[PDB]
From a paper:
Collectively, these data indicate that in Phanta the substitution His193Gln plays a key role in reducing ΦF, whilst the substitution Thr69Val is required to suppress formation of the protonated chromophore species observed in eCGP123H193Q. The Phanta chromophore has a pKa of 4 which is significantly lower than that for the other proteins (pKa, 6), and is a desirable property that minimises unwanted pH-driven fluctuations when it is used as a pcFRET acceptor. Omit maps show that the electron density corresponding to the imidazolinone moiety of the chromophore in each of the four protomers of Phanta is well defined. In contrast, there is evidence for disorder around the 4-hyroxybenzyl ring in protomers C and D of the Phanta structure, suggesting that it is mobile within the chromophore cavity. Since a rigid chromophore is considered a prerequisite for efficient fluorescence emission, it is possible the increased mobility observed contributes to the low fluorescence efficiency of Phanta (ΦF, 0.003). Accordingly, in the weakly fluorescent Phanta and eCGP123H193Q the planar network is significantly altered, leaving the chromophore without the underlying scaffold present in eCGP123T69V and eCGP123. In Phanta and eCGP123H193Q, Glu215 no longer interacts with the side chain of Gln193 that replaces the histidine at position 193. Instead a hydrogen bond is formed between the Nδ1 of Gln193 and the Oγ of Ser142, which in turn forms a hydrogen bond with Oη of the chromophore. In Phanta the hydrogen bond network around the chromophore extends from the Oη of the 4-hydroxyphenyl ring to the N2 of the imidazolinone ring, and the O2 of the imidazolinone ring via protein matrix hydrogen bonds involving the side chains of Tyr177, Arg91 and Glu144.
Numbering used by the authors: 3 to 61, 65 to 220
Amino acid sequence: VIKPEMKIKLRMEGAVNGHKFVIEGEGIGKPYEGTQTLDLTVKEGAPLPFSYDILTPAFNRAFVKYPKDIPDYFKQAFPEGYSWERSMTYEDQGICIATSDITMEGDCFFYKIRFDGTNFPPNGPVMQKKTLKWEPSTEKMYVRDGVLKGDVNMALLLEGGGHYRCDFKTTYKAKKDVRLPDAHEVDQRIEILSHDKDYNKVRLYEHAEARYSML
């Protein structure tokens, strides 16, 4: 079902501190390699007045290099697909919630993403566009009350700079019942490869690999 080379088509509808926006994307990834690249275009919301970095993790855990001995909840979820619900709490009270419904047709993945952010201080590094990139991270994957959950302590590097923290909490729900995996970790690095002046056009990349804890 999951082809070694999978295309990506997405649509994100959002609002951050009241600013409404629509972003559309087209890309390709090698799901077994855990690599993917997206070309993102700002369709609505003129020049985005907030850091584009807060959006990047919202733009698919099917794109992870999974060891065989660890059940792959995300790749088994297809063709029907899966959904995810994420909470993103920033250290200065900025709060984001994003939802994504992921479907599949042929060699292509389709995402309907909803992104909502509020309480970002006007002088904070998000509204001030003072963020550089996300630091490489580790998502702790585990089953709590019969659902697959993912936690990640994220850190945005700043101009100067030091770090600006965010806590992610995600719920992964496959549409049809599949094998829930034992506790594992997913290491990732998300990067903006290129962009134009106002981030109207962005080229995004991600490399992700699953593994067990050496404990």
